[PDB]
């Protein structure tokens, strides 16, 4: 199976089941990472090193955290590097928790957008960095392509989009646990290319548990 | 006479004669406006003010210019305000000219649809604004109602349809020059309500030559 259209039986249910799954997840780092909270530091440090290359130039004024959850990434990666951050997530309870989780530094979160990425239009020329981590599997192929194009139109000069996510060994696979798909590297690269985005960097995440999907970062604009 | 069914003798001929009329019209603003090219600025400027009331919320991703001709409206009203525009018109030569007329900004016209509105089905979830100007008189009452129902089905959330057109003092009047009708305000309102639309705003156009039909704008959803 090479596309979401093949594997998703009913698009409305694909989205509503995902919302229902996330509604019952603890609003904690462990919850955000599916019981793998302990990998957060290795993930964040690797993400920082990847992002720092572009800030040696990409601007430091504003970032957008997509599928931000309670703000694991906003706390440790984005807020230390960007003067302001916007967060978008489908799960209201996570964004409410974010306000506590993020503490004093979280007062620099400008907008908390409670919204599906498939329904979200980032404002034109607004963001230096748009971070999209462990959420692309929650969108259809068409919605992903379209969102990426809207993201591109939301970038400031020299701004970048970063996708960081699990890659499948082959094809497109439905996870009926959380109502998401996982796609292989070639599938993801094709969707990016078809969105008219340039691939500025690609990097496999190392030092990771073996029984979980491989993780790639892609910087785009 | 209170309906097109009481004035149009042969429906096929009503459509074919209009197509023939438009085929021999020069592809210019003066041709679009039947010799009143000079009213274009007062018209466009009034349309902009009318529409901006909804943009200040109706989205700005995409518009549909119905009976667009060479793109008089697409050029001055829609392309500046909307990220993409689709054009639909029965007259192939006008849409060809449009590619020249629109120039550089015209590169952001997504689709050129050569089709009668009576045969056109805008696809679900496509448009923030559907603009229908100086063309409703080319459709029968039933095709008009059905088209407007189709349009409603294609609107994005908060999206609107705008009709801007000549209104007759009374009844339904046939123009056997261009093979169109003009309908009074009551007739037009009846057709709107029957299409399951709500009236959002109505505005009479000011500063027009006294010898031409009154013009009204209706915003609908
Ligand atoms: N369609 C959708 N649009 C926006 N957010 C979604 C979504 N589907 C799932 N989500 C959110 O995606 C997140 C995935 S868990 C990952 C959280 C965060 N990116 C991190 O790495 O820490 C959850 O917060 C869930 O609520
Ligand atoms: N049935 C029909 N479906 C779609 N377009 C039609 C049509 N009958 C006539 N037209 C088109 O309607 C237009 C009317 S002239 C007005 C053009 C444009 N709305 C403007 O205001 O500048 C012409 O371009 C003509 O080709």
UniProtKB/Swiss-Prot annotation, chains A, B:
Query: Per UniProt, what does mutating residue 175 to N do?
Result: Strongly reduces methyltransferase activity with CENPA
As stated in the Swiss-Prot or TrEMBL entry, residues carrying the post-translational modification N-acetylthreonine are 4
**Keywords recorded for this protein, A-Z:** Acetylation, Methyltransferase, Nucleus, S-adenosyl-L-methionine, Transferase
Question: Per the record, what is the consequence of mutating residue 178 to N?
Answer: Reduced methyltransferase activity with CENPA
- GO cellular component terms given for this protein: cytoplasm; cytosol; nucleoplasm; nucleus
Report the transmembrane regions from the record: none
Q: What's the impact of mutating residue 178 to A?
A: Induces a decrease in methyltransferase activity
What happens when you mutate residue 175 to A? Induces a slight decrease in methyltransferase activity
The listed outcome for residue 178 to K is: Induces a strong decrease in methyltransferase activity
Tell me what reaction this enzyme catalyses: N-terminal L-alanyl-L-prolyl-L-lysyl-[protein] + 3 S-adenosyl-L-methionine = N-terminal N,N,N-trimethyl-L-alanyl-L-prolyl-L-lysyl-[protein] + 3 S-adenosyl-L-homocysteine + 3 H(+); N-terminal L-seryl-L-prolyl-L-lysyl-[protein] + 3 S-adenosyl-L-methionine = N-terminal N,N,N-trimethyl-L-seryl-L-prolyl-L-lysyl-[protein] + 3 S-adenosyl-L-homocysteine + 3 H(+); N-terminal L-prolyl-L-prolyl-L-lysyl-[protein] + 2 S-adenosyl-L-methionine = N-terminal N,N-dimethyl-L-prolyl-L-prolyl-L-lysyl-[protein] + 2 S-adenosyl-L-homocysteine + 2 H(+)
Gene Ontology molecular functions: histone methyltransferase activity; N-terminal protein N-methyltransferase activity; protein methyltransferase activity
**Which positions bind S-adenosyl-L-methionine?**
67, 72, 89-91, 117-118, 133
Q: What is its main location?
A: nucleus
User: Which Pfam family, giving just one, matches this sequence?
Assistant: Methyltransf_PK
Stated role: Distributive alpha-N-methyltransferase that methylates the N-terminus of target proteins containing the N-terminal motif [Ala/Gly/Pro/Ser]-Pro-Lys when the initiator Met is cleaved. Specifically catalyzes mono-, di- or tri-methylation of the exposed alpha-amino group of the Ala, Gly or Ser residue in the [Ala/Gly/Ser]-Pro-Lys motif and mono- or di-methylation of Pro in the Pro-Pro-Lys motif. Some of the substrates may be primed by NTMT2-mediated monomethylation.
The family line of this record is: Belongs to the methyltransferase superfamily. NTM1 family.
Its name, as the record gives it, is N-terminal Xaa-Pro-Lys N-methyltransferase 1
Which species is listed as the source?
Homo sapiens
């Amino acid at each position: 199976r090479g596309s979401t259209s093949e594997v998703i039986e009913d698009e409305k249910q694909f989205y509503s089941k995902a919302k229902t799954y996330w509604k019952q997840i603890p609003p904690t780092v462990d919850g955000m990472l599916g019981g793998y909270g302990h990998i957060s530091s290795i993930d964040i440090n690797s993400s920082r090193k990847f992002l720092q290359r572009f800030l040696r130039k990409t601007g430091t004024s504003c970032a957008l955290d997509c599928g931000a959850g309670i703000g694991r990434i906003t706390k440790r990666l984005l807020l230390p590097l960007f003067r302001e951050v916007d967060m978008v997530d489908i799960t209201e309870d996570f964004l409410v928790q974010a306000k506590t989780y993020l503490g004093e530094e979280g007062k620099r979160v400008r907008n908390y957008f409670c919204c599906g990425l498939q329904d979200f239009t980032p404002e034109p020329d607004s963001y230096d960095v748009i971070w999209i981590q462990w959420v692309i599997g929650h969108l259809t192929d068409q919605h992903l392509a379209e969102f990426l194009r809207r993201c591109k139109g939301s970038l400031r000069p020299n701004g970048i989009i970063v996708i960081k996510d699990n890659m499948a060994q082959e094809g497109v696979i439905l996870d009926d646990v959380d109502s998401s798909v996982c796609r292989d590297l070639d599938v993801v690269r094709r969707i990016i290319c078809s969105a008219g985005l340039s691939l500025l960097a690609e990097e496999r995440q190392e030092n990771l548990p073996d029984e979980i999907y491989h993780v790639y970062s892609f910087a785009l604009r």
